[PDB]
Amino acid sequence: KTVVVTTILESPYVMMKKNHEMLEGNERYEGYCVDLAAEIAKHCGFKYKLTIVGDGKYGARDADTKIWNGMVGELVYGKADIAIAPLTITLVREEVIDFSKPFMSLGISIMIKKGTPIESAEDLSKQTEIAYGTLDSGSTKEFFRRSKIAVFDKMWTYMRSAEPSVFVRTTAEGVARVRKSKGKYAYLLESTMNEYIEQRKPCDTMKVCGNLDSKGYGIATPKGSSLGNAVNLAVLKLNEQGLLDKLKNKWWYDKGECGS
Amino acid sequence: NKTVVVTTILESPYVMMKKNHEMLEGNERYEGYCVDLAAEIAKHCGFKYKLTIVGDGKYGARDADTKIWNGMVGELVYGKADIAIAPLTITLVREEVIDFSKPFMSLGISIMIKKGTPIESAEDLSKQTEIAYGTLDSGSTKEFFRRSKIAVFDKMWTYMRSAEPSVFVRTTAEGVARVRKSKGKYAYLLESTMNEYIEQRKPCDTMKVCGNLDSKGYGIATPKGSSLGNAVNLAVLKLNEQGLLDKLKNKWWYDKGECGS
Ligand SMILES: O=c1[nH]c2cc(C(F)(F)F)c(N3CCOCC3)cc2n(CP(=O)(O)O)c1=O
Ligand SMILES: O=c1[nH]c2cc(C(F)(F)F)c(N3CCOCC3)cc2n(CP(=O)(O)O)c1=O
């Protein structure tokens, strides 16, 4: 009767403790979602084992083989009982697994060098002295390609033809580009990482407050699982108890390195 | 079993009477964000529906004396409605008795200031007293501060609970009026969605401070075991992913706003 939790290494959601080599079981891991799992299990009454998903992916269906990979696949195919991770609640995923209400709300956001006079996607869209881009693949790029909102379609039209390319191979390449470009590159990215990067040395980037869309991370369970319902009630309870915000403060801001 | 009874609530700009409503019948008497949302949900789920305004004008809570649900939640629980399509907050006590979709709008407690004022953050307010600040004298925003064990909010609560003259107001309109008339010495704490709305209202003298203090959601609600719950949830996700919910926010807040940029 031990519940198999699948999760994914993504700081500060799930991290290896520095001393993980000298620990066993669930004690090897720490982070926002490690704490969330313990609170969920307490409030629902279950024992559990943490596992890192074998392929390191969140979960998508291969168009050509119909096969889910990532944590979604592990749920669909019987390898784990629950996923506790910053796993985006999406239609195609909700067609095959069950999601709790979100424990975190987030969206696409703008990163600038600390000190840059920009304040919105609208600002970016109607000028050209500041370049801006996204990851060369994934949901943020797809959001701009797929979108029918003029401001963002304008940004996409600028991005898809910019020379030299305004796209980067990794989030880290993106952040570095903001840092070296003396205010002439802005990076578009998931908002929790923007905030996380804003709070650590070298303390030279800012998240622009307003987000460009609204998305959530939720706890995932296979369709018809007896757990989905209680787990969902737990997520709502923890939010209202302030626990979800406490953990965000714990893992993002309490050891912040930049004062503000 | 071939007309779906939608319960909702008169709350601007979610549901409103059209100017000429008396010359109209049925669902055409109404307009607004949730009226449009109801039309999209129905089209995507393939049902016909009738808008009805909740008899008691309430969202949903248990009576202190009888423990019986009032508001739209009650109309779902006790069989009077098939679906609630309204800015109904997703909460633990409500989700125990009815089902919610994933949120179609995300929001939180926010700060309102007079347009032109050196304040932003909850943290700033907690560190000073020149600028008084308060909430509605009842409801979820007040309960958030009273309940919070987070230091900055507990500081703000300890300030508000004893501040004299009272920083609490009897109505949303009284709070707004107090911001407008206090020359920057009064900030109001209220739901982010209404703050944004008030910002788009004449005489255009209030501003929403950007970052929120907590995170909630509004969802579509159905009675437990409804056949609709699953389809409605996927319809909500599709509408978010297609950009449709954001277009509706823009329509009823900024297009029909009185202050634009
Ligand atoms: O479920 C999903 N959850 C995700 C959660 C996050 C994070 F922010 F780390 F919490 C991220 N980060 C985006 C920025 O660089 C670091 C990784 C990607 C996610 N992806 C793939 P995407 O949606 O293509 O980005 C998913 O699929
Ligand atoms: O489900 C709920 N949805 C709510 C939606 C709204 C609005 F923003 F108008 F859409 C408001 N407004 C708060 C600001 O002044 C006007 C009314 C209250 C709501 N309440 C009561 P609360 O949570 O105690 O505030 C609920 O219970």
* CATH superfamily name and code, A107-215: Periplasmic binding protein-like II (3.40.190.10)
**HEC profile of A53-77:** CCCCCCCCECCCCCCECHHHHHHHC
Instruction: Judge: A105–B100 Cβ closer than 8 Å, yes or no.
Output: no
In the DSSP assignment, the letter for residue B69 is B
Q: Assign domain B1-107+217-256 one CATH number from 3.90.950.20, 3.40.190.10, 3.30.565.10, 3.40.190.150.
A: 3.40.190.10
Q: Quote the tokens at residue B89.
A: 């907050």
Long-range CB contacts (within 8 A, 24+) of A22-27:
A25/A49, A25/A50, A26/A50
Phi (first) and psi of residue B117, to 5 degrees: -160, 130
- B201, B112 in Cβ contact below 8 A? no
CA distance A143 to B89: 27
Which chain A residues contact residue B214 at CB under 8 A? Answer: 239, 245
Smallest Cβ–Cβ distance between B210 and the set A90, A105, A209 belongs to A209
Burial of A79 (0-12, 13-18, 19+ CB in 10 A): middle
Minimum Cα–Cα distance from B235: chain A residue: A91
- Most informative mutation of B70, B194, B199, B206 for ligand 2 (most atoms within 8 A of CB): B194
Instruction: Judge: B92–A233 Cβ closer than 8 Å, yes or no.
Output: yes
CB contact B210 to A (< 8 Å): yes
At A60, the amino acid letter reads A
| Among A residues 26-65, those touching chain B with beta carbons less than 8 Å apart | none
Topology of domain B108-216 in CATH is D-Maltodextrin-Binding Protein; domain 2 (3.40.190)
- A28, A20 in Cβ contact below 8 A? yes
Q: Is the backbone of residue A228 left (phi > 0), alpha (psi -120 to 50) or beta?
A: alpha
A192 close to ligand 1 (CB < 6 Angstrom): yes
Closest Cα to atom 26, ligand 1: which residue? A58
Instruction: Judge: A99–B103 Cβ closer than 8 Å, yes or no.
Output: no
Phi (first) and psi of residue A135, to 5 degrees: -55, 145
Instruction: Judge: A245–B214 Cβ closer than 8 Å, yes or no.
Output: yes
Domain spans in chain A, listed from the N-terminal domain onward: 1-106+216-255, 107-215
Topology of domain A1-106+216-255 in CATH is D-Maltodextrin-Binding Protein; domain 2 (3.40.190)
Q: Quote the tokens at residue A72.
A: 């979604």
Q: What is the resolution of this structure in A?
A: 2.5
The SS3 assignment for A237 reads: helix
CA distance B35 to B13: 10
CA distance B259 to A250: 39
Q: What does A98-148 look like in DSSP terms, one character per residue? A: EEPSPSEEE-EEEEEETT-----HHHHHT-SSSEEE-BSSSHHHHHHHH--
Residues with Cβ within 8 Å of residue B242, at least 6 apart in sequence: none
**HEC profile of A136-147:** CCCHHHHHHHHC
Long-range CB contacts (within 8 A, 24+) of A224-227:
A224/A98, A225/A81, A225/A82, A225/A98, A227/A3, A227/A44, A227/A46, A227/A81, A227/A82
